[PDB]
């Protein structure tokens, strides 16, 4: 039920891809992920299926057939303290890219040209793990944004999350047209004594 999370007027960026926000409320889903991460302000535009740079190709990679939504709101107190918060690291350069939906917690030194880098730093070897400059005294583009990306997938397994949107109310005793879950017909509706299992 994503209808109550759209008109709340509490998110700075509530966009989707492929599936419309007003259509995924009455549609089943096999499994929904929860990719939560805190980035800067200029990196929000790079979180899109089909982008490149130094963040989407080295940290979080989005699939080409991504049919989900991107939830992002403004914040400066739940992830940035006074004096500068340098607790969120990120990878800037690496020897290879990252496939979509893949995590990496290793720590290696990037190799630029010669001087193979394996446990030794200095010349031709730089530390890729930097740090964001989340400070409340900076501008607007340097403000942190807690982006929560939701992934939608469909497999052959029966989906446990399901349910259509609200419909017209009930009437009884009158001759009426009716439609129950797509069962279109005409008749009189009443209570019944019937002992349905």
């Amino acid at each position, epitope marked *: 039920d994503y209808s109550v999370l759209y008109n709340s007027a509490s998110f700075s960026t509530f966009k989707c891809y492929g599936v419309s926000p007003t259509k995924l409320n009455d549609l089943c889903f096999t499994n929904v992920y929860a990719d939560s991460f805190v980035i800067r302000g200029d990196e929000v535009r790079q979180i899109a299926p089909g982008q490149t740079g130094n963040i989407a190709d080295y940290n979080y990679k989005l699939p080409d057939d991504f049919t989900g939504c991107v939830i992002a709101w403004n914040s400066n107190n739940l992830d940035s303290k006074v004096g500068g918060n340098y607790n969120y690291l990120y990878r800037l350069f690496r020897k290879s890219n990252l496939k979509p939906f893949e995590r990496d917690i290793s720590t290696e030194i990037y190799q630029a*040209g010669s001087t193979p880098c394996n446990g030794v730093k200095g*010349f031709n070897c730089y530390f890729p793990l930097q740090s964001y400059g989340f400070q409340p005294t900076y501008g607007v583009g340097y403000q942190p944004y807690r982006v929560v990306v939701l992934s939608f997938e469909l497999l052959h397994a029966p989906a446990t999350v399901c349910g259509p949107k609200k419909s017209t109310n009930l009437v009884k005793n009158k001759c009426v047209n009716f439609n129950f879950n797509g069962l279109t017909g005409t008749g009189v509706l009443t209570e019944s004594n019937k002992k349905f299992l």
Partner: antibody, heavy 107, light 113 residues
Framework: LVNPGASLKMSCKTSGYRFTSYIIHWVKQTPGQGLEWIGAIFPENDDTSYSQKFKGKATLTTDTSSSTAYMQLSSLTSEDSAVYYC??????????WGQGTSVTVSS | QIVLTQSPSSLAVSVGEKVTLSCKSSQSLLYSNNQKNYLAWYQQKSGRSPKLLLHWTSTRESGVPDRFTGSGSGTDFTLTISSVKAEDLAVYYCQQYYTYPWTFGGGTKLEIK
């Protein structure tokens, strides 16, 4: 033509190849002597690498939009005059080691 | 700051004659982690850009004849040329690839007898 103590800037652009290299190199060779390495440059964070012999006389600046490496030479001397060659370094060589420009130093 | 010593000063080679030139490094240029020797061989024809002939001393350059073959063990590095031609004559140099600062210890003119 640069007088002793003048500042000289040399720029070279790779031709047929678009970036795709993690190092750039500068070499000074006087005629009748072997090539001597000067400095190495990195495309992202500046390498700022200088040889101990050339340290304090050479400055390395790279501009992505320009697509050409920049080398600044200071305190030029008669010994300093030599042919300097723009070069690079990827896996091995990929038409990255370019040609050289002769330097003459006199008042 | 490992200086590299390369000898001899001059190489006299006839056309179609195999020749061996050796460059010696003060410290071993083999990285312990990969157990691979690091060195570069360069050709320097007159009025020409410095050109890499052999890399790592184990891999030939693309579009390079099999006549140029180099084998290096530990400190000693050896490059062997065969079927030498007038176009082939050039100054030959050994460049350390093991660690900064880079040192060009290359140094061998090639002449035809």
């Amino acid at each position: 033509l640069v007088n002793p103590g003048a500042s000289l800037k040399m720029s070279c652009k790779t031709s047929g190849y678009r970036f795709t290299s993690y190092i750039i190199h500068w070499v000074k060779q006087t005629p009748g002597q072997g090539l001597e390495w000067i400095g190495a440059i990195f495309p992202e964070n500046d390498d700022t690498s200088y040889s101990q012999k050339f340290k304090g006389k050479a400055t390395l600046t790279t501009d992505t939009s320009s697509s050409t490496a920049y080398m600044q030479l200071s305190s030029l001397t008669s010994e300093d005059s030599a042919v300097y060659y723009c070069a690079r370094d990827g896996e091995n060589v990929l038409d990255y080691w370019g040609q050289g420009t002769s330097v003459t130093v006199s008042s | 700051q490992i200086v590299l010593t390369q000898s001899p000063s001059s190489l006299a080679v006839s056309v179609g004659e195999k020749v061996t030139l050796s460059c010696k490094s003060s410290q071993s240029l083999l990285y312990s982690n990969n157990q691979k020797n690091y060195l570069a061989w360069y050709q320097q024809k007159s009025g020409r850009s410095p050109k890499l002939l052999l890399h790592w001393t184990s891999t030939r350059e693309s579009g390079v004849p099999d006549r140029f073959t180099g084998s290096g063990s530990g400190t000693d590095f050896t490059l062997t040329i065969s079927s030498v031609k007038a176009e082939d004559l050039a100054v030959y140099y050994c460049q350390q690839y093991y660690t900064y600062p880079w040192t060009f210890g290359g140094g061998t003119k090639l002449e035809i007898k």
